[PDB]
Design a protein around this nucleic acid. Structure first.
Lengths: 147, 104, 49, 121, 49, 53, 125, 186, 49
RNA sequence: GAAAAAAUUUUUUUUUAGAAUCUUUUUAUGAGUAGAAAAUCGUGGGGUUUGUGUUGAAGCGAAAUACGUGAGUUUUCGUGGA
RNA sequence: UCUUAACCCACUCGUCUUGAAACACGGACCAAGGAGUCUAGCAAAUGUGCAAGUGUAUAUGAUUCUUUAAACAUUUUACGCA
RNA sequence: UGUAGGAGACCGAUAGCAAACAAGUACCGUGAGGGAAAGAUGAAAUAGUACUCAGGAAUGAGCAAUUAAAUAGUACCUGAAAUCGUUAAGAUGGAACGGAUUAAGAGAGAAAACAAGUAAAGAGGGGAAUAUUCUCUUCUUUAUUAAAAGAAACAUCAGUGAUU
C-alpha cells in the first residue's frame, strides 16, 4: 500500500496538498455530525433532507420474524420449474404443473409479469396478490391457500 | 485451443529469465534464450515463436548448433547442417558462425 | 490430444494418455499474481510495538 | 528438522554452546577416530582424555602427531607436546588447538573409557 | 510439473470426469477463454480477412 | 461531515482500545478442538460420543 | 559552450549544481528543487545558479552515447559476451566494480576475442 | 507572442488504451484495432472503442432484450460488446445467433439447446471481418445503482435522485423537507 | 505506534482460488512458458512431464 | 530486400530494422504559487529469477576525456577486510 | 578536470503576510534521528471472479503436519446484501 | 502477571523493554518519588608489547620485536563530517561566494580521439582424418605497405540575411 500513496507524490511540499494558507488543522467546524442544522444545515438539507424531527407512533418490540415476507412475482413463478419439465407441460395439454412456492421458500405471490396464455398451472402459497389471483384464474390455473 | 506464440509474447515480453535490460543507459534490452537467433528482445528474435527454431550457440567450451523436439550438433559440418534442416536468416546464421568459430 | 507417458527409466515409454481439460483453461497471469500476493498477505505474521 | 521440541534459531544454539554443562563440554571436545579403529570400535568420534595421542589435520601445525598434554575445557582447546610456541617474553607454552582440527590415533584406555567403548560397540 | 499417471488420471476425475461424488469438487465448472483461438495472425492471414 | 458523504454510525467514542480483541488462534483452536474430541473418542474404546436428538 | 563531436551534439557540459550550496555548509551539491517562496530560482531572477531543464536533453539518435561511439554495457560475468558479440559494432564493454582479477582478466581476453575494447581496461592491474 | 485558446492544444478525453494486464483482452483489442484502422467501415472502430471501455461501460445485456431486438432481424448475427445474462422470467428461446464478450454458462447452454450459435469475437472477426449483415448491440448504461443516486440534490425541488441513506430504518430520512407536515417538502 | 489492529490477512474467494490453481496448471502445461520460467527443459521428452 | 569500399569476373572488408505505453514521419505547443495528475529515482524487508564473494566485496575518502535534463547511475585510485 | 583571474550580471535563506534584502519572525556549526499514519465503517474510481444471485459465516472434514500460524475440502430451503 | 517452550516479511546499539552491561543500578529529590550514561582488538593473547638506548620520572626513539596486519597496543574493528595542525600552490585597497564567457596555470587521461592487412619467431589454444598425423585459429615480439577519421582552408551548391 505505502509505496503508491499521495504522501509519496507530495513528500517534500510543506502543507503538502492541504493548503499552505490554510495550515491544516483537525475538525475545524466541530466534531462528527454535530454541525448539522446549525452550521452544516445547507449540506444536510441538500444531501439528507428528511433527517430532522419526530415522525410516527412507536412499536416497542418489533420482532421482525412475526411479519416475515418472502415474495415472488408471477413472472418468475414458471422459472422455479426446470426447462425440460416445462417443455413436457407445454406439450401435454391434459396436465398442469403443481408449484409449491413455500416448499421453494416463498409466502406471497405478486402480480408483475406475464403468464403464457392457454396454459394452466397450480400455485400453492400463503398469500397472493389480487393481480396474481386474477392472472392465475385468467390462464385457467388454480391457486391453493396453504399453511 | 487457449494458446499461441502471439499470446506467449503477451505473457512473456517483460517476464522471462533470459530477458536482460541495461541499467547503464536505457537503450539495450536483450533476450538470451537457447533458440534465440539475434540476442535483442523481440518475438521475431525469440526462440518461443518459430515452430522448429534453429540457433547457433556456444556452451560448455563448445559451439553448438541447436534445432527444435530439441536436437543439438557441433565449418563444413556447420554448412551441411544449415542446408539440411533449416527453413535473411541463412546469411545471419553464417555471419554468427564466423564470429563464434574463432572464440576460445 | 495425446501425451506420452514414460517409465522411471526414461529410455522406456509406456501408455499414452489424453491431456486433461484443465490444461485447456485460459491463462490469467494477472489473476495468478493478484491471488498469490493476496495469499502471501495471509501467510505473513502480525506485528506490534 | 521435524521435531518442534527444540529451537532451530541461531540464538538458542549459541547460548547453549556458551553455557555448556560438563557432559556437553565433553561432547564438543570429541574427535574423529582413526580408520581401522573406527571399524574396531564401530564408532566415528570419541571424547578426548588426558593421555590420548592425536594427529593434527588443519592449520599451520597440520601433519604433526603427538600426545595430549592438558585439555582446556573452558576455551575448548587441547594442548599437544610438540606444538610449542614462545610468547612475547620468550616463555614457552603450548598452542591451544580446537578439537575439530585433530584426529585421534591412540586413545587412552581406562575404566570410564572401557564403559564408553562398551556403550558404543 | 512432474506427474504420476495416477495423479494425471485423478486430476481429470477431480475437475469433472466420471462424476465421482466424493473426489469431484461440488458442482464445479472449469472456466473458458474469451478468445476462442489466440492465433490472431492466422485470422489476419485468412482469405476473407 | 461534508459533500456527498453519508452520516457515520461508529461507536468508537468510548475507550474501545482496551475493549477490542483480534483472533489469531482460530485454525490452531480448531485443531485443538479436533484433537480433544478425537482423544476422547479413542479413550472410550473408539465407541460413539455423539448425542441423538 | 555547446560540445559537438561528429554528429553527436551534447548541449551542456556543466552539471546543474544546487543553489548556494557553499553558502550553507549543510547543503549538498546534487540538485534539489526549491519549494521556497521568493527563492531566486523558481522566481526566475537572472544571475543565480541555473535550474536544470528538459530542453537540455539529448538528441534521440545519440540519447545515451559516448565519444567512444558505442553504447556502454556493464559486465560482471563472462556469459555477457554472447549478446555483446552481435552488438559489438554498436556497444562497448565496461567491467563492473566487484570483478575478481582472475575473472576480470578472462573477461578482458574474451572482449579482445569479441573485438571490443574495455573502456576501463587498465583497472585491477 | 501568439494568443492561443487552450494553448493551441487539443486536450480531448477518455481511455488511451486498455488498462488491464489480461493477455486475452490485450490480444483481442490489438486484433480489433488492426481491423478498425484498415477496414473502411465504422463498425469495427466502434467495436474496438467499446472493447476498451471501463467495467461500468461493460454492462450485461439481457438475453430477452437481445431476443426482443433480433425478431425483426430474423436470420442475422447479433454482436454484443458486453456479457449476455440469462432470464428466469423468460419461458423459452426462439433460436439466436449471438457474439458476446462473456456468456453465463446457463445462457450459453440455453442457446445451444435452442440450436442457436455462441460466437467469440475472434470467431466473429474471422467470419464477418466487414460486419456486413451484422447487428451491433449494447446493454443499459443508466441501469446501475450509482446512477440512481446521481442528479439533482435530495430535497431540492423536482429532484428524484436516491439519497445515500444512513440505514434502512423507518424513523429515518422521511421527515424535514420530505413531508409537508415537518418543515416543508420538496 | 504499530498495533495488532492492522489488516494483515485478506479474504481470497473460492471461485478465484480454483481458477488460479486451474490456470496455473494449464500454464505449467505450456512448454515455452516452462523454459521462460527458467527450467532447463532441453533434454525433456514430453510437454507436461 | 542487396548497398558501398578494399583486393586480384572471382576473393577480402563493413552493414542487412518489424519489441503497439512499439517504430518511422509531420505540424503545432512550452508562464506559474496554492493545487491535481503522470513518469521516474533511492532506502528497509519478502517471494521469484541468475549472479557477485577474501586472485578482498561491501563500507568509507579522493577522483572519472563516464552516462543521465534531473534525482541519480556507473566506474578509477586510496583506505578497507566481510 | 581543478585554479585563480578578467568583462557583464549577481541583496540572508526558510517563513507567515496583498507585500520581506529588511529596522518582520526562526536559523553559531556539523552528524545521526525527526512529522498525513493505522483501524473501523462508507463512497466513487478502476481492475478481477461470478451473476438473479453472491459471499462461505461460526464450524466441520481430511492418508494436513520443520516450513502447515496455510493450503485443501464441505454427503441440495442458515445468514448478510441484492 | 510468574514459569516453560516455539516464532517472526520485527529492532540492530540515538533503535528495540527504562535496561544487549555489575540497571531498576549509579545519581538526584525532605519524602511520596524521579531515574541515567554504559557492547565489539585478534584466528589465536597458553601470541597482550620482550630487549636496548636517551630520560628524575612520565615518556620517547631504536640496528631491537609479536602478529597475516600494530597511523591492529586493551580510552584497541571500521573510523564519516564538523574542527584543528604540517607542507606546497594560489589569492589578498571596507566583505564572502555565485551566474554567464573566455584565460593562464596546475593536474589527469588514449576507451573514437590514426594506421587494416603481409612477411619473419616467440607464447598459447582449437577442429578434422584413421593416441597422433593432417589442418584452422588469438596474443607477444621485429618492419612493411595500406587506408580511414576528425580538425583546418578554399571552392561549389541550396536556405537565409546584410551590403551598392
Amino acid at each position: 500500500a505505502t509505496r503508491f500513496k499521495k504522501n509519496r507524490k507530495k513528500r517534500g511540499h510543506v502543507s503538502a496538498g492541504h493548503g499552505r494558507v490554510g495550515k491544516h488543522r483537525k475538525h475545524p467546524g466541530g466534531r462528527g455530525k454535530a454541525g448539522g442544522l446549525h452550521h452544516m444545515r445547507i449540506n444536510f438539507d441538500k444531501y439528507h433532507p428528511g433527517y430532522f424531527g419526530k415522525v410516527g407512533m412507536r412499536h416497542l418490540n418489533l420482532l421482525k420474524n412475526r411479519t416475515y415476507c418472502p415474495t415472488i412475482n408471477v413472472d418468475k413463478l414458471w422459472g422455479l420449474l426446470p426447462e425440460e419439465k416445462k417443455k413436457e407441460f407445454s406439450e401435454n395439454k391434459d396436465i398442469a404443473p403443481v408449484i409449491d412456492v413455500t416448499r421453494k421458500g416463498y409466502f406471497k405471490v405478486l402480480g408483475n409479469g406475464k403468464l403464457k396464455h392457454n396454459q394452466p398451472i397450480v400455485v400453492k402459497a400463503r398469500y397472493f396478490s389480487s393481480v396474481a389471483e386474477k392472472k392465475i384464474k385468467a390462464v385457467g390455473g388454480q391457486c391453493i391457500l396453504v399453511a | 485451443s487457449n494458446v499461441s506464440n502471439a499470446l506467449v509474447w503477451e505473457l512473456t515480453r517483460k517476464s522471462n529469465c533470459f530477458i536482460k535490460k541495461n541499467k547503464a543507459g536505457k537503450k539495450g534490452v536483450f533476450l538470451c534464450d537457447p533458440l534465440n537467433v539475434n540476442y535483442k528482445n523481440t518475438p521475431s528474435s525469440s526462440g518461443l515463436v518459430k515452430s522448429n527454431s534453429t540457433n547457433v550457440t556456444l556452451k560448455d567450451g563448445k559451439v553448438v548448433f541447436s534445432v527444435k523436439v530439441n536436437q543439438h550438433f557441433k565449418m563444413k559440418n556447420v554448412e551441411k547442417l544449415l542446408q539440411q534442416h533449416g527453413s535473411k536468416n541463412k546469411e545471419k546464421l553464417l555471419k554468427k558462425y564466423k564470429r563464434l568459430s574463432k572464440l576460445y | 490430444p495425446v501425451a506420452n507417458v514414460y517409465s522411471t527409466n526414461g529410455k522406456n515409454v509406456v501408455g499414452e494418455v489424453e491431456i486433461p481439460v484443465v490444461f485447456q483453461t485460459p491463462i490469467r497471469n494477472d489473476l495468478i499474481q493478484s491471488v498469490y500476493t493476496n495469499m502471501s498477505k495471509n501467510r505473513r505474521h502480525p506485528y506490534a510495538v | 528438522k521435524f521435531n518442534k521440541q527444540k529451537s532451530s534459531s541461531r540464538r538458542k544454539m549459541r547460548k547453549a554452546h556458551f553455557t555448556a554443562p560438563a557432559g556437553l563440554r565433553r561432547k564438543i571436545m570429541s574427535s574423529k577416530l582413526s580408520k581401522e579403529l573406527r571399524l574396531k570400535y564401530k564408532t566415528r568420534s570419541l571424547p578426548v582424555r588426558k593421555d590420548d595421542e592425536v594427529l593434527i589435520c588443519r592449520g599451520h601445525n597440520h601433519g604433526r602427531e603427538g600426545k595430549v598434554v592438558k585439555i582446556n575445557r573452558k576455551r575448548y582447546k587441547i594442548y599437544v607436546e610438540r606444538v610449542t610456541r614462545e610468547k612475547v617474553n620468550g616463555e614457552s607454552t603450548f598452542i591451544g588447538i580446537h578439537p575439530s582440527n585433530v584426529v585421534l590415533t591412540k586413545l587412552k584406555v581406562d575404566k570410564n573409557r572401557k564403559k564408553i567403548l562398551d556403550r558404543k560397540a | 510439473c512432474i506427474w504420476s499417471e495416477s495423479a494425471f488420471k485423478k486430476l481429470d476425475v477431480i475437475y469433472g470426469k466420471i462424476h465421482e461424488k466424493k473426489v469431484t469438487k461440488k458442482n464445479y465448472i472449469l472456466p473458458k477463454s474469451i478468445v476462442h483461438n489466440p492465433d490472431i495472425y492466422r485470422i489476419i492471414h485468412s482469405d476473407k480477412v | 461531515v461534508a459533500h456527498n458523504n453519508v452520516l457515520p454510525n461508529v461507536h468508537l467514542h468510548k475507550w474501545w482500545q482496551h475493549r477490542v480483541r483480534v483472533n489469531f488462534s482460530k485454525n490452531i483452536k480448531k485443531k485443538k478442538r479436533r484433537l480433544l474430541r478425537e482423544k476422547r473418542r479413542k479413550a472410550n474404546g473408539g465407541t460413539p460420543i455423539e448425542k441423538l436428538h | 559552450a555547446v560540445k559537438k563531436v561528429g554528429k553527436i551534439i551534447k548541449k551542456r557540459t556543466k552539471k546543474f549544481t544546487r543553489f548556494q550550496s557553499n553558502r550553507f555548509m549543510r547543503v549538498k551539491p546534487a540538485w534539489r528543487k526549491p519549494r521556497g517562496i521568493d527563492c531566486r530560482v523558481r522566481r526566475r531572477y537572472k544571475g543565480t545558479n541555473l535550474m536544470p531543464s528538459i530542453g537540455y536533453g539529448s538528441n534521440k539518435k545519440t540519447k545515451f552515447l559516448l565519444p567512444n561511439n558505442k553504447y556502454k554495457y556493464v559486465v560482471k560475468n563472462v556469459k555477457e559476451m554472447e549478446p555483446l558479440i552481435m552488438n559489438h559494432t554498436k556497444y562497448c564493454v565496461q567491467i563492473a566494480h566487484n570483478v575478481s582479477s582472475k575473472k576480470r582478466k578472462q573477461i578482458i581476453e574474451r572482449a579482445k576475442q569479441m573485438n571490443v575494447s574495455v573502456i576501463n581496461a587498465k583497472a585491477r592491474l | 507572442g501568439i494568443a492561443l485558446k487552450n494553448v493551441g492544444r487539443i486536450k480531448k478525453h477518455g481511455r488511451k488504451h486498455l488498462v488491464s494486464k489480461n493477455p486475452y483482452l490485450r490480444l483481442l483489442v490489438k486484433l480489433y484495432n488492426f481491423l478498425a484502422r484498415r477496414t473502411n467501415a465504422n463498425f469495427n472502430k466502434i467495436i474496438a472503442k467499446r472493447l476498451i471501455m471501463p467495467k461500468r461501460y461493460r454492462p450485461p445485456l439481457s438475453l430477452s432484450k437481445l431476443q426482443y431486438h433480433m425478431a425483426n432481424h430474423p436470420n442475422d448475427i447479433a454482436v454484443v460488446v458486453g456479457s449476455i445474462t440469462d432470464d428466469k422470467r423468460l419461458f423459452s428461446l426462439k433460436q439466436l445467433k449471438v457474439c458476446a464478450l462473456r456468456f453465463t454458462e446457463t445462457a450459453r447452454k440455453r442457446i445451444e439447446d435452442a440450436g442457436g450459435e455462441c460466437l467469440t469475437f475472434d470467431q466473429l472477426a474471422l467470419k464477418y471481418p466487414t460486419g456486413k449483415k451484422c447487428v451491433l448491440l449494447r446493454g443499459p448504461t443508466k441501469a446501475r445503482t450509482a446512477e440512481k443516486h446521481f442528479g439533482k440534490a435530495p430535497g431540492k425541488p423536482k429532484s428524484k435522485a436516491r439519497p445515500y441513506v444512513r440505514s434502512k430504518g423507518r424513523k429515518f430520512e422521511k421527515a424535514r423537507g420530505r413531508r409537508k407536515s415537518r418543515a416543508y417538502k420538496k | 505506534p504499530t498495533k495488532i489492529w492492522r489488516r494483515w490477512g485478506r479474504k481470497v474467494n473460492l471461485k478465484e482460488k480454483r481458477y488460479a490453481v486451474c490456470s496455473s496448471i494449464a500454464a505449467s502445461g505450456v512448454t515455452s512458458l516452462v523454459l521462460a520460467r527458467g527450467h532447463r527443459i532441453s533434454h525433456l521428452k514430453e510437454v507436461p512431464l
